[PDB]
Amino acid sequence: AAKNVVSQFVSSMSASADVLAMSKIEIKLSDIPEGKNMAFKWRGKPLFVRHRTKKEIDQEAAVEVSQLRDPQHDLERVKKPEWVILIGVCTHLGCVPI
Amino acid sequence: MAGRPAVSASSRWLEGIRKWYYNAAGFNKLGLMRDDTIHENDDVKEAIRRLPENLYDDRVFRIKRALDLSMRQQILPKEQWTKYEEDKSYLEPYLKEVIRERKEREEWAKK
Amino acid sequence: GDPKEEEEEEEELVDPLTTVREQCEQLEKCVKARERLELCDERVSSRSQTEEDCTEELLDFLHARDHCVAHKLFNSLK
Amino acid sequence: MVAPTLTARLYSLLFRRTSTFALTIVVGALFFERAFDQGADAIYEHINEGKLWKHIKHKYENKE
Amino acid sequence: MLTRFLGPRYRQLARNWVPTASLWGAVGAVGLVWATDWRLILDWVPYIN
Amino acid sequence: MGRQFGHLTRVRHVITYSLSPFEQRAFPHYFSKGIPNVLRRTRACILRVAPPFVAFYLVYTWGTQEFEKSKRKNPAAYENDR
Amino acid sequence: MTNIRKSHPLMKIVNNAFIDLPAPSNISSWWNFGSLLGICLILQILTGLFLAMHYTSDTTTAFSSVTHICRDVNYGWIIRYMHANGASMFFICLYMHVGRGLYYGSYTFLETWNIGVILLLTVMATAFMGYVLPWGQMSFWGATVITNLLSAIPYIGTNLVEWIWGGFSVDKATLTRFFAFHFILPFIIMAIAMVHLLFLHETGSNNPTGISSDVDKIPFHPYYTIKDILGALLLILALMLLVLFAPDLLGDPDNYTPANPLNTPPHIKPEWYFLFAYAILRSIPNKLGGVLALAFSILILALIPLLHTSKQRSMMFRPLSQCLFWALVADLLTLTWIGGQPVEHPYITIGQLASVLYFLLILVLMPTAGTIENKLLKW
Amino acid sequence: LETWNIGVILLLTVMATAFMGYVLPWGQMSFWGATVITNLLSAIPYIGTNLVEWIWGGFSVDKATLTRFFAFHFILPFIIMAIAMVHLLFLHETGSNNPTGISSDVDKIPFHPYYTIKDILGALLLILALMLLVLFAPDLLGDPDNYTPANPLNTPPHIKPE
Amino acid sequence: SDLELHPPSYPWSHRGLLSSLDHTSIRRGFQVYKQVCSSCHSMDYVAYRHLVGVCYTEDEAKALAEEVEVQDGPNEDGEMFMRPGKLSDYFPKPYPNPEAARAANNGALPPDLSYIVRARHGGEDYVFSLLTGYCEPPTGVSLREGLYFNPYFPGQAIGMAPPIYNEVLEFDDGTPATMSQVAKDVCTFLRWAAEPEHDHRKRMGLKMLLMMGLLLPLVYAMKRHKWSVLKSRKLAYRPPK
Amino acid sequence: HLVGVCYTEDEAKALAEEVEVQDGPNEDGEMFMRPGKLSDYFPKPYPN
Ligand code: HEC
Ligand code: HEM
Ligand code: HEM
Ligand code: HEM
């Protein structure tokens, strides 16, 4: 009995299912052209839409794998090098970029 | 309250109603005399302190066993109840003197 | 508007409720009340003007029938 | 609760030491809670057979 | 009030503490009037008119 | 809080006996004497408890009956006629 | 038991009042309501705090936030109903706490009893502003009639009503003030409840016999903690029975429509624990008389200790007073029944008679009952 | 030791209350000051994001977090009163301290006529200092950026707590 | 007329202490709402996502939501624009403001159907009797235009044309759309729209009864065991001489 | 707010009535224009 009632009160501060409904959003791709970005609301944080062009994809693979804190390639982070969607927050504390 | 012993009775005599009320009160069923259930104010408490040792010690056990009866929500057998006629005021003589003492003390601060 | 069907289909369809209306249409409670309903209707209609109606008598007739209707209505649904 | 009985071994094995007394309370809570939910829920389905969503969910999602 | 019974000793006690109780109600009167500027009362003082 | 066991009162010449809770049955003669007890307890109070609440039901059964009678129309259609 | 326990200048000695406190052995079941009241109090704070994490006091989003609590918040529906039905359990437990003192003469503890009335007033005030929080056509209108009763006072009645309202009528200004006031008042009750116990531990409990129990005191910890735990479960069972099987059994259905100042509900009435007070006020055509009688009936508790006449203290051995006590309880139930009914001809007579009997019993019949028995016992 | 340890607990409670109350105005310093500090809990291993969202009531600081803070900001100060009473309870048993640091049992004085009037003078110096800010420089300490409504899409020029 | 009639206590599939809602009826009950009620009755507290796991699947409810166009706030140029609805969208509002609603009807304002089961005396029993209780006005009663006689309605004159008749709609599963059957489904739906917690309310209720039905005898045993010392306690008074 | 600060009550009423404002649902259920009042806030140049 104690575990159930405690978990019921703890669960109240977690999801608030009306919040969970807006977890996934939909947005067009033809509104913005290549290079430019648009900012809107997703999960309470700003996210941007970017369209990689022909002369920027090649430079992505130019950086060596063993050059950052965590070794990560560029051909696996995206399902297709044509498009990319990213959340406009700082990876440290969550601050939007310019 | 319940039907009076005679037939139904509105108010007959005086000792009959008092005897009927004594059994109705029900403190005899716990083995307590009348003065074992009195309210202990600053007057009665002093008049208890003047009780003789034999009488005071008897009162302690009568109260002690009554609380045992009340704890179990039981009563004493029919033969161990406090008879109304056999009930006697062991505290009235001591109360009266404290009544006399307090009235004299109060009226001395008034005159 | 209320108990009509679109009709023209098979047997034009029927409702369980209107049949059950006939259940307390023979019960003793709802035949006596209907007798009172007629008396109010005959009395009120006869008078040229009267600020009275038969709502109370109708409600008494409805109260008896509807309660008996609710007893044996849901078994014919679903 | 007499000479060779279940409770005599139950007390000595577990309840003799208060440290193991708490173990059966927490371990017993694990097994009781798992069985109680399934035990109490299975009654609910029997009372409401063909009523809840899971009893009519099979009618959709390509299963019918 | 300010006594216990009805006797000459308490009657003297009540009379002896009347002037202090007499002026103690002024604090209850003026202080309450001062707190909420009781107009009907503030309309009679000459300097505060 | 200035009051604890040791100075509560003066008790003399009283002997008490008690048993270990493990050497006695928790529910001894539950229905053997408890049920005859509750009948004794209820009778001792039914003459002082029931009559006050029996009257309230009589008020209930009459105050509500009159209320519906007020809402019910009365045959006062005369003096108008046809 | 492990050592000499050493130490001691800490807060443990304050907890000796919960473990080593002497208590009468014959304390009946009518006493768990003391610990039940504490259980109810910390239960309202626990559920209330989690309710306040999703409730917004603005009128445009007050009612809609209550719906969001039940419809959207995970397990948020139960918390709202143990809060709504807990107040029903609070006042159920509150009225038996008062009733036991009436029967067992616990009002002889003048300090504790007087603080008890203050505790009663604080909860009734706290529960009143909580009902206005959902803002549901019973919150708006229930608060409309009750607060407008203060307009009967002269020279301050109109001034303080607007001061209470924060405007010319109940509105968003009143709603925000109530939620803030409803948040703080329960924490005042905790402080007073500790003060309430502080005036009782000096003299101990009050055995149903009514005689001094100093000869048969028992430790609290092994006997009454397990007795209060059983009493707590009976409270949880009773409260949870409402919440999980009839959540709206006590609450009025009209409260589920959003408050509309232009529309009046078919019947306007407060919650069931204030219904007896409503009947007394409605029994007098006068407006000033009604508000005074409404306050006097609640404040008559402080006048009870000054009306004691019997040489005994508890009603255990007072059969004449026992008949009057259950007549008062039955009459208090008649007042509750009258309050929930509209003001028509069968209830104006019953309402006036019940109210005139409520004051007549305590003020006249009960003190005369104690005097009569004093003659019957030769003292 | 008893009083000092309760003192740290008292300190932690106030900094929690002050931080939670700063988010109440919701003014681009409240939203973003709470954003950076609360996101620090995501660094906790294996439970960071689990409790960060449980604090947030969602995926980021939003209306769900704002309502929770106001309710939490209401309750915590009344907890501080209870702890402060316990804070004194662990001190009056062992007395007070002196600048000398030696036991002052040989030269104790009554509190009522000497320190009540000393605390009243100290209280006025507090009221004077507090009222000096309020009536002559109300926004001297607060950051000016807090007066623009919170905008999650825009970041302040400089992020910083009180 | 100004008189009250007590609604009959219709048996329900969810009238028991542990009985749950019939989710088959809920699915049919919504079909009444989306075709009959939604024309002039609002439900602004139930979303299209609420029907998931109750009466429709996720794909079913998404199709239902996308069937109705709704507003999606300001465009990039700061203008309104229509778009197909989503799961998170609430049920469409027939009118923008209550003033429009009073204009659409003969002044009467259709109450919100989200809580109408719990906001009326009698619950679904009154609503079911109200929907099916229409009858010809008795002799001696005159009704103004736009007013219809319904005894279950307080006042007996309601601004409601009979909204349910035989074969007014068509049910997906093929059950006959009779006058009484359609009212039963919407009443079942209107209860779920008012108390979505109804199933979990009883599910935890049964668990409580089994849990508390076992603990209460057990907790009583601990009380008796600890108190058995005082219950079996003999007092002896042995004063001197 | 400008009353008693920079404009009189009559001056501020003229300033407010000089600009039309949109508020109040008509009994037909539609928005309609009206001259502003003292209680009206300064007009918003753009809706969003
Ligand atoms: C013709 C448009 C229209 C239709 C279609 C409609 N309603 Fe209504 N409804 C109204 C109006 C107008 C009122 C208010 C009547 C009044 O207050 O006199 C109302 C009121 C109600 C009430 C309130 C009754 C009361 O006593 O408060 C309920 C319940 C209700 N409707 C249910 C339904 C249901 C269920 C349906 C679908 C079968 C439905 N309505 C279809 C227009 C409509
Ligand atoms: C003795 C303490 C309390 C009592 C007697 C009490 C009583 C009530 C009552 C009767 C209601 C009406 C609910 C309804 O009718 O639907 C209510 C609502 C409410 N209370 Fe309290 N309350 C107490 C303490 C608190 C506390 C401490 C808080 C917050 C910290 C709180 C927050 C709320 C809220 C937000 C509501 C509106 C939400 C709802 O009604 O479900 N309450 N309260
Ligand atoms: C939130 C409200 C209250 C709380 C938490 C509370 C708490 C308590 C507790 C725990 C006790 C001791 C338990 C017991 O002796 O049975 C007690 C005693 C008492 N209380 Fe309260 N109480 C509250 C309100 C009231 C009220 C409304 C009254 C009205 C008269 C009251 C009057 C008394 C009295 C007379 C006693 C004496 C008990 C005795 O005779 O031993 N209290 N209170
Ligand atoms: C709201 C927060 C606090 C309140 C109301 C409070 C209150 C008090 C008061 C009134 C005293 C006695 C006054 C005096 O002796 O000068 C005291 C003593 C003390 N407090 Fe706190 N305090 C708080 C927070 C703290 C904090 C943050 C600390 C951090 C170490 C602390 C540690 C102490 C200590 C060490 C003493 C010893 C005084 C002595 O040696 O005479 N308290 N507290």
JSON list of N, CA, C and O and ligand atoms in Angstrom, two decimals, chain G residues 41 44-45 48-49 51-52 55 66 80 83-84 87 90 126-127 130-131 133-134 179 182-183 186 189 255 271 273, ligand 2:
[
{"chain": "G", "resi": 41, "resn": "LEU", "atom": "N", "xyz": [-5.36, 16.20, 8.99]},
{"chain": "G", "resi": 41, "resn": "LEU", "atom": "CA", "xyz": [-4.71, 17.48, 8.74]},
{"chain": "G", "resi": 41, "resn": "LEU", "atom": "C", "xyz": [-3.51, 17.33, 7.82]},
{"chain": "G", "resi": 41, "resn": "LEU", "atom": "O", "xyz": [-3.40, 18.04, 6.82]},
{"chain": "G", "resi": 44, "resn": "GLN", "atom": "N", "xyz": [-4.60, 16.52, 4.19]},
{"chain": "G", "resi": 44, "resn": "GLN", "atom": "CA", "xyz": [-5.01, 17.65, 3.37]},
{"chain": "G", "resi": 44, "resn": "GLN", "atom": "C", "xyz": [-3.81, 18.43, 2.86]},
{"chain": "G", "resi": 44, "resn": "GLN", "atom": "O", "xyz": [-3.79, 18.89, 1.72]},
{"chain": "G", "resi": 45, "resn": "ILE", "atom": "N", "xyz": [-2.79, 18.59, 3.71]},
{"chain": "G", "resi": 45, "resn": "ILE", "atom": "CA", "xyz": [-1.59, 19.30, 3.30]},
{"chain": "G", "resi": 45, "resn": "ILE", "atom": "C", "xyz": [-0.85, 18.52, 2.22]},
{"chain": "G", "resi": 45, "resn": "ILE", "atom": "O", "xyz": [-0.35, 19.09, 1.24]},
{"chain": "G", "resi": 48, "resn": "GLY", "atom": "N", "xyz": [-3.13, 18.58, -0.82]},
{"chain": "G", "resi": 48, "resn": "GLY", "atom": "CA", "xyz": [-3.31, 19.97, -1.22]},
{"chain": "G", "resi": 48, "resn": "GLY", "atom": "C", "xyz": [-2.09, 20.54, -1.91]},
{"chain": "G", "resi": 48, "resn": "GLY", "atom": "O", "xyz": [-2.21, 21.29, -2.88]},
{"chain": "G", "resi": 49, "resn": "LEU", "atom": "N", "xyz": [-0.90, 20.22, -1.40]},
{"chain": "G", "resi": 49, "resn": "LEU", "atom": "CA", "xyz": [0.32, 20.74, -2.00]},
{"chain": "G", "resi": 49, "resn": "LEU", "atom": "C", "xyz": [0.48, 20.25, -3.43]},
{"chain": "G", "resi": 49, "resn": "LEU", "atom": "O", "xyz": [0.86, 21.03, -4.32]},
{"chain": "G", "resi": 51, "resn": "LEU", "atom": "N", "xyz": [-1.97, 19.31, -5.34]},
{"chain": "G", "resi": 51, "resn": "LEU", "atom": "CA", "xyz": [-3.02, 19.98, -6.11]},
{"chain": "G", "resi": 51, "resn": "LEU", "atom": "C", "xyz": [-2.61, 21.39, -6.49]},
{"chain": "G", "resi": 51, "resn": "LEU", "atom": "O", "xyz": [-2.92, 21.86, -7.59]},
{"chain": "G", "resi": 52, "resn": "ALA", "atom": "N", "xyz": [-1.90, 22.08, -5.59]},
{"chain": "G", "resi": 52, "resn": "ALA", "atom": "CA", "xyz": [-1.47, 23.45, -5.85]},
{"chain": "G", "resi": 52, "resn": "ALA", "atom": "C", "xyz": [-0.37, 23.54, -6.90]},
{"chain": "G", "resi": 52, "resn": "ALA", "atom": "O", "xyz": [-0.04, 24.65, -7.33]},
{"chain": "G", "resi": 55, "resn": "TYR", "atom": "N", "xyz": [-2.91, 23.97, -10.05]},
{"chain": "G", "resi": 55, "resn": "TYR", "atom": "CA", "xyz": [-4.08, 24.84, -9.93]},
{"chain": "G", "resi": 55, "resn": "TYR", "atom": "C", "xyz": [-3.67, 26.29, -10.10]},
{"chain": "G", "resi": 55, "resn": "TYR", "atom": "O", "xyz": [-2.67, 26.74, -9.54]},
{"chain": "G", "resi": 66, "resn": "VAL", "atom": "N", "xyz": [-8.79, 22.63, -12.97]},
{"chain": "G", "resi": 66, "resn": "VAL", "atom": "CA", "xyz": [-9.28, 21.49, -12.21]},
{"chain": "G", "resi": 66, "resn": "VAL", "atom": "C", "xyz": [-9.59, 20.32, -13.14]},
{"chain": "G", "resi": 66, "resn": "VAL", "atom": "O", "xyz": [-9.30, 19.16, -12.82]},
{"chain": "G", "resi": 80, "resn": "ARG", "atom": "N", "xyz": [-7.38, 14.68, -6.33]},
{"chain": "G", "resi": 80, "resn": "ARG", "atom": "CA", "xyz": [-8.44, 15.66, -6.20]},
{"chain": "G", "resi": 80, "resn": "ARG", "atom": "C", "xyz": [-9.58, 15.14, -5.33]},
{"chain": "G", "resi": 80, "resn": "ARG", "atom": "O", "xyz": [-10.20, 15.90, -4.59]},
{"chain": "G", "resi": 83, "resn": "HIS", "atom": "N", "xyz": [-8.79, 14.75, -1.63]},
{"chain": "G", "resi": 83, "resn": "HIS", "atom": "CA", "xyz": [-8.85, 16.10, -1.08]},
{"chain": "G", "resi": 83, "resn": "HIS", "atom": "C", "xyz": [-10.29, 16.55, -0.87]},
{"chain": "G", "resi": 83, "resn": "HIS", "atom": "O", "xyz": [-10.61, 17.15, 0.16]},
{"chain": "G", "resi": 84, "resn": "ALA", "atom": "N", "xyz": [-11.16, 16.28, -1.84]},
{"chain": "G", "resi": 84, "resn": "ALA", "atom": "CA", "xyz": [-12.55, 16.69, -1.72]},
{"chain": "G", "resi": 84, "resn": "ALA", "atom": "C", "xyz": [-13.29, 15.87, -0.68]},
{"chain": "G", "resi": 84, "resn": "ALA", "atom": "O", "xyz": [-14.10, 16.41, 0.09]},
{"chain": "G", "resi": 87, "resn": "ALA", "atom": "N", "xyz": [-11.94, 16.34, 3.26]},
{"chain": "G", "resi": 87, "resn": "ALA", "atom": "CA", "xyz": [-12.59, 17.38, 4.04]},
{"chain": "G", "resi": 87, "resn": "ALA", "atom": "C", "xyz": [-13.90, 16.88, 4.63]},
{"chain": "G", "resi": 87, "resn": "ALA", "atom": "O", "xyz": [-14.30, 17.30, 5.72]},
{"chain": "G", "resi": 90, "resn": "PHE", "atom": "N", "xyz": [-12.58, 15.03, 7.43]},
{"chain": "G", "resi": 90, "resn": "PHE", "atom": "CA", "xyz": [-12.12, 15.99, 8.43]},
{"chain": "G", "resi": 90, "resn": "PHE", "atom": "C", "xyz": [-13.28, 16.44, 9.32]},
{"chain": "G", "resi": 90, "resn": "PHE", "atom": "O", "xyz": [-13.19, 16.40, 10.55]},
{"chain": "G", "resi": 126, "resn": "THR", "atom": "N", "xyz": [-11.11, 27.60, 6.73]},
{"chain": "G", "resi": 126, "resn": "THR", "atom": "CA", "xyz": [-10.25, 27.05, 5.69]},
{"chain": "G", "resi": 126, "resn": "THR", "atom": "C", "xyz": [-11.04, 26.26, 4.67]},
{"chain": "G", "resi": 126, "resn": "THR", "atom": "O", "xyz": [-10.81, 26.37, 3.46]},
{"chain": "G", "resi": 127, "resn": "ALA", "atom": "N", "xyz": [-11.99, 25.44, 5.13]},
{"chain": "G", "resi": 127, "resn": "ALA", "atom": "CA", "xyz": [-12.79, 24.64, 4.20]},
{"chain": "G", "resi": 127, "resn": "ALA", "atom": "C", "xyz": [-13.73, 25.50, 3.38]},
{"chain": "G", "resi": 127, "resn": "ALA", "atom": "O", "xyz": [-14.15, 25.07, 2.30]},
{"chain": "G", "resi": 130, "resn": "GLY", "atom": "N", "xyz": [-11.66, 26.88, 0.41]},
{"chain": "G", "resi": 130, "resn": "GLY", "atom": "CA", "xyz": [-11.31, 25.81, -0.50]},
{"chain": "G", "resi": 130, "resn": "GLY", "atom": "C", "xyz": [-12.43, 25.48, -1.47]},
{"chain": "G", "resi": 130, "resn": "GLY", "atom": "O", "xyz": [-12.19, 25.17, -2.63]},
{"chain": "G", "resi": 131, "resn": "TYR", "atom": "N", "xyz": [-13.68, 25.54, -0.99]},
{"chain": "G", "resi": 131, "resn": "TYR", "atom": "CA", "xyz": [-14.82, 25.27, -1.86]},
{"chain": "G", "resi": 131, "resn": "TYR", "atom": "C", "xyz": [-14.93, 26.29, -2.97]},
{"chain": "G", "resi": 131, "resn": "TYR", "atom": "O", "xyz": [-15.43, 25.97, -4.05]},
{"chain": "G", "resi": 133, "resn": "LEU", "atom": "N", "xyz": [-12.42, 27.60, -4.52]},
{"chain": "G", "resi": 133, "resn": "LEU", "atom": "CA", "xyz": [-11.30, 27.45, -5.45]},
{"chain": "G", "resi": 133, "resn": "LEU", "atom": "C", "xyz": [-11.70, 26.82, -6.78]},
{"chain": "G", "resi": 133, "resn": "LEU", "atom": "O", "xyz": [-11.24, 27.32, -7.83]},
{"chain": "G", "resi": 134, "resn": "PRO", "atom": "N", "xyz": [-12.48, 25.73, -6.84]},
{"chain": "G", "resi": 134, "resn": "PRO", "atom": "CA", "xyz": [-12.81, 25.16, -8.16]},
{"chain": "G", "resi": 134, "resn": "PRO", "atom": "C", "xyz": [-13.58, 26.11, -9.07]},
{"chain": "G", "resi": 134, "resn": "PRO", "atom": "O", "xyz": [-13.52, 25.94, -10.29]},
{"chain": "G", "resi": 179, "resn": "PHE", "atom": "N", "xyz": [-7.16, 31.49, -2.61]},
{"chain": "G", "resi": 179, "resn": "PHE", "atom": "CA", "xyz": [-6.16, 30.44, -2.82]},
{"chain": "G", "resi": 179, "resn": "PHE", "atom": "C", "xyz": [-4.92, 30.70, -1.98]},
{"chain": "G", "resi": 179, "resn": "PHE", "atom": "O", "xyz": [-4.35, 29.76, -1.41]},
{"chain": "G", "resi": 182, "resn": "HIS", "atom": "N", "xyz": [-6.08, 30.08, 1.56]},
{"chain": "G", "resi": 182, "resn": "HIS", "atom": "CA", "xyz": [-6.26, 28.65, 1.74]},
{"chain": "G", "resi": 182, "resn": "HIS", "atom": "C", "xyz": [-4.94, 27.91, 1.85]},
{"chain": "G", "resi": 182, "resn": "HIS", "atom": "O", "xyz": [-4.90, 26.80, 2.40]},
{"chain": "G", "resi": 183, "resn": "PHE", "atom": "N", "xyz": [-3.86, 28.48, 1.32]},
{"chain": "G", "resi": 183, "resn": "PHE", "atom": "CA", "xyz": [-2.55, 27.83, 1.41]},
{"chain": "G", "resi": 183, "resn": "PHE", "atom": "C", "xyz": [-1.94, 27.99, 2.79]},
{"chain": "G", "resi": 183, "resn": "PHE", "atom": "O", "xyz": [-1.31, 27.06, 3.31]},
{"chain": "G", "resi": 186, "resn": "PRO", "atom": "N", "xyz": [-3.90, 26.25, 6.75]},
{"chain": "G", "resi": 186, "resn": "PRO", "atom": "CA", "xyz": [-3.61, 24.92, 7.31]},
{"chain": "G", "resi": 186, "resn": "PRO", "atom": "C", "xyz": [-2.31, 24.84, 8.08]},
{"chain": "G", "resi": 186, "resn": "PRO", "atom": "O", "xyz": [-2.22, 24.07, 9.04]},
{"chain": "G", "resi": 189, "resn": "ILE", "atom": "N", "xyz": [-2.98, 25.90, 11.46]},
{"chain": "G", "resi": 189, "resn": "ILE", "atom": "CA", "xyz": [-3.67, 24.87, 12.23]},
{"chain": "G", "resi": 189, "resn": "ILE", "atom": "C", "xyz": [-2.68, 23.90, 12.86]},
{"chain": "G", "resi": 189, "resn": "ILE", "atom": "O", "xyz": [-2.88, 23.42, 13.98]},
{"chain": "G", "resi": 255, "resn": "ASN", "atom": "N", "xyz": [-21.87, 21.76, -9.11]},
{"chain": "G", "resi": 255, "resn": "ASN", "atom": "CA", "xyz": [-20.53, 22.34, -9.05]},
{"chain": "G", "resi": 255, "resn": "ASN", "atom": "C", "xyz": [-19.70, 22.07, -10.29]},
{"chain": "G", "resi": 255, "resn": "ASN", "atom": "O", "xyz": [-18.62, 22.66, -10.43]},
{"chain": "G", "resi": 271, "resn": "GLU", "atom": "N", "xyz": [-21.67, 23.29, 1.64]},
{"chain": "G", "resi": 271, "resn": "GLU", "atom": "CA", "xyz": [-21.36, 21.88, 1.82]},
{"chain": "G", "resi": 271, "resn": "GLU", "atom": "C", "xyz": [-22.12, 21.31, 3.02]},
{"chain": "G", "resi": 271, "resn": "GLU", "atom": "O", "xyz": [-22.72, 22.04, 3.82]},
{"chain": "G", "resi": 273, "resn": "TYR", "atom": "N", "xyz": [-21.26, 19.99, 5.79]},
{"chain": "G", "resi": 273, "resn": "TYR", "atom": "CA", "xyz": [-20.83, 20.26, 7.15]},
{"chain": "G", "resi": 273, "resn": "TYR", "atom": "C", "xyz": [-21.17, 21.67, 7.61]},
{"chain": "G", "resi": 273, "resn": "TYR", "atom": "O", "xyz": [-21.00, 21.97, 8.80]},
{"chain": "K", "resi": 2, "resn": "HEM", "atom": "C1", "xyz": [-7.35, 21.70, 6.86]},
{"chain": "K", "resi": 2, "resn": "HEM", "atom": "C2", "xyz": [-6.87, 21.88, 5.63]},
{"chain": "K", "resi": 2, "resn": "HEM", "atom": "C3", "xyz": [-7.74, 21.94, 4.34]},
{"chain": "K", "resi": 2, "resn": "HEM", "atom": "C4", "xyz": [-9.06, 21.78, 4.17]},
{"chain": "K", "resi": 2, "resn": "HEM", "atom": "C5", "xyz": [-10.14, 21.47, 5.23]},
{"chain": "K", "resi": 2, "resn": "HEM", "atom": "C6", "xyz": [-9.35, 21.95, 2.76]},
{"chain": "K", "resi": 2, "resn": "HEM", "atom": "C7", "xyz": [-10.59, 21.86, 2.17]},
{"chain": "K", "resi": 2, "resn": "HEM", "atom": "C8", "xyz": [-10.85, 21.97, 0.82]},
{"chain": "K", "resi": 2, "resn": "HEM", "atom": "C9", "xyz": [-12.13, 21.78, 0.19]},
{"chain": "K", "resi": 2, "resn": "HEM", "atom": "C10", "xyz": [-13.45, 21.40, 0.89]},
{"chain": "K", "resi": 2, "resn": "HEM", "atom": "C11", "xyz": [-11.99, 21.98, -1.12]},
{"chain": "K", "resi": 2, "resn": "HEM", "atom": "C12", "xyz": [-13.13, 21.86, -2.15]},
{"chain": "K", "resi": 2, "resn": "HEM", "atom": "C13", "xyz": [-12.84, 20.80, -3.20]},
{"chain": "K", "resi": 2, "resn": "HEM", "atom": "C14", "xyz": [-14.09, 20.56, -4.00]},
{"chain": "K", "resi": 2, "resn": "HEM", "atom": "O1", "xyz": [-15.20, 20.79, -3.46]},
{"chain": "K", "resi": 2, "resn": "HEM", "atom": "O2", "xyz": [-13.97, 20.13, -5.18]},
{"chain": "K", "resi": 2, "resn": "HEM", "atom": "C15", "xyz": [-10.60, 22.31, -1.38]},
{"chain": "K", "resi": 2, "resn": "HEM", "atom": "C16", "xyz": [-10.03, 22.59, -2.60]},
{"chain": "K", "resi": 2, "resn": "HEM", "atom": "C17", "xyz": [-8.70, 22.88, -2.83]},
{"chain": "K", "resi": 2, "resn": "HEM", "atom": "N1", "xyz": [-7.70, 22.91, -1.88]},
{"chain": "K", "resi": 2, "resn": "HEM", "atom": "FE1", "xyz": [-7.95, 22.65, 0.11]},
{"chain": "K", "resi": 2, "resn": "HEM", "atom": "N2", "xyz": [-8.17, 22.21, 2.10]},
{"chain": "K", "resi": 2, "resn": "HEM", "atom": "C18", "xyz": [-7.16, 22.22, 3.04]},
{"chain": "K", "resi": 2, "resn": "HEM", "atom": "C19", "xyz": [-5.82, 22.44, 2.80]},
{"chain": "K", "resi": 2, "resn": "HEM", "atom": "C20", "xyz": [-5.26, 22.75, 1.58]},
{"chain": "K", "resi": 2, "resn": "HEM", "atom": "C21", "xyz": [-3.86, 23.03, 1.34]},
{"chain": "K", "resi": 2, "resn": "HEM", "atom": "C22", "xyz": [-2.79, 23.02, 2.46]},
{"chain": "K", "resi": 2, "resn": "HEM", "atom": "C23", "xyz": [-3.71, 23.30, 0.04]},
{"chain": "K", "resi": 2, "resn": "HEM", "atom": "C24", "xyz": [-2.44, 23.64, -0.77]},
{"chain": "K", "resi": 2, "resn": "HEM", "atom": "C25", "xyz": [-1.19, 23.56, -0.28]},
{"chain": "K", "resi": 2, "resn": "HEM", "atom": "C26", "xyz": [-5.01, 23.18, -0.59]},
{"chain": "K", "resi": 2, "resn": "HEM", "atom": "C27", "xyz": [-5.28, 23.37, -1.92]},
{"chain": "K", "resi": 2, "resn": "HEM", "atom": "C28", "xyz": [-6.52, 23.24, -2.51]},
{"chain": "K", "resi": 2, "resn": "HEM", "atom": "C29", "xyz": [-6.80, 23.42, -3.92]},
{"chain": "K", "resi": 2, "resn": "HEM", "atom": "C30", "xyz": [-5.77, 23.79, -5.00]},
{"chain": "K", "resi": 2, "resn": "HEM", "atom": "C31", "xyz": [-8.10, 23.21, -4.11]},
{"chain": "K", "resi": 2, "resn": "HEM", "atom": "C32", "xyz": [-8.84, 23.29, -5.46]},
{"chain": "K", "resi": 2, "resn": "HEM", "atom": "C33", "xyz": [-8.61, 22.00, -6.23]},
{"chain": "K", "resi": 2, "resn": "HEM", "atom": "C34", "xyz": [-9.76, 21.07, -5.96]},
{"chain": "K", "resi": 2, "resn": "HEM", "atom": "O3", "xyz": [-10.80, 21.54, -5.44]},
{"chain": "K", "resi": 2, "resn": "HEM", "atom": "O4", "xyz": [-9.64, 19.85, -6.26]},
{"chain": "K", "resi": 2, "resn": "HEM", "atom": "N3", "xyz": [-5.94, 22.85, 0.38]},
{"chain": "K", "resi": 2, "resn": "HEM", "atom": "N4", "xyz": [-9.94, 22.30, -0.16]}
]
